[PDB]
């Protein structure tokens, strides 16, 4: 099964998900001369003071750090979307340097790493059902560059050396994402895709404009993870991130000018 080596990855996916080379596929490039200014876009409305989060997980490909989305505590709303949208799991997809890492890129530009809070619309009940809508999903995407520590990112990185292979997950209560959240809100907007299989085409995209920075050493800490599980030959987690697809007949709207 999939992966993102040279013989798993990207490139191989669309034999089993021929959704792959559909027409809404992520991520994309952001050509900032082409997006338009959509004055009619609202701020987004991140709602996260409520946020539990409970666990943290290596499944194979990231890490996901999970919240209790049996409730409307942790929320997206606002901006592109209709209704609610709760706070499921966030991850990261990184590079074996800091040149890439990144899934969306901004007039070709990779960043280090890309973060991903994942939230689904409660008007469909439940994260299974969400993915079948076109609607379904929004996922708030945030660049990491690489200069300065993020101090709210911490917390994450001291505790991968516990869930260091597949399948391996610690308790990780009491973390708040708001700590990993850029100054500014202004976003790029535009209908997608989940960016691993099965790449389902049900993801409303907000990607932040502002980067946020964090260190040299809280980035070689995700790249100790492992792809493989315990006792396997150790194949580091690097380069887990989809390449830019075509954008076909969409349209990257912005909330600034
Ligand atoms: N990378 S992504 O945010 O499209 C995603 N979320 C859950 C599975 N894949
Ligand atoms: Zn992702």
Same mark, same amino acid.
């Given at each position: 099964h999939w992966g993102y080596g040279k013989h798993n990855g990207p490139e191989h996916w669309h034999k089993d !998900?021929?959704?792959?080379? %559909? =027409?809404r596929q992520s991520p994309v490039d952001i050509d900032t001369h082409t997006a338009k200014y959509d004055p009619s876009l609202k701020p987004l409305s991140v709602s996260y003071d409520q946020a539990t989060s409970l666990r943290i997980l290596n499944n194979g490909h990231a890490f996901n750090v999970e919240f $209790? $989305?049996?409730? +409307?505590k942790a929320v997206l709303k606002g901006g592109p979307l209709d209704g609610t949208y709760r706070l499921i799991q966030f991850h990261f997809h990184w590079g074996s340097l800091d040149g890439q890492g990144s899934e969306h890129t901004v007039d070709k530009k990779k960043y280090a790493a890309e973060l991903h809070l994942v939230h689904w619309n409660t008007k469909y009940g439940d994260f299974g059902k969400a993915?079948?809508? /076109? +609607? %379904?999903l929004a996922v708030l995407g945030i660049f990491l560059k690489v200069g300065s520590a993020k101090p709210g990112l911490q917390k994450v990185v001291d505790v991968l050396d516990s869930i260091k292979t597949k399948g391996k997950s610690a308790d990780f209560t009491n !973390? +708040? /994402?708001? @700590? #990993? #959240?850029?100054?500014s809100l202004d976003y790029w907007t535009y209908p997608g895709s989940l960016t691993? /299989?099965?790449?389902? =085409?049900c993801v409303t995209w907000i990607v932040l404009k502002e980067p946020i920075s964090v260190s040299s050493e809280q980035v070689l800490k995700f790249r100790k993870? &492992? !792809? &493989? %599980?315990? @006792? =396997?030959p150790e194949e580091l987690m690097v380069d887990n991130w989809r390449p830019a697809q075509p954008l076909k007949n969409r349209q990257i709207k912005a909330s600034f000018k």
């Open positions: !998900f021929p959704i792959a080379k %559909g =027409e $209790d $989305d049996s409730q +409307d993915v079948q809508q /076109p +609607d %379904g !973390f +708040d /994402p708001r @700590g #990993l #959240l850029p100054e691993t /299989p099965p790449l389902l =085409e993870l &492992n !792809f &493989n %599980g315990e @006792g =396997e």
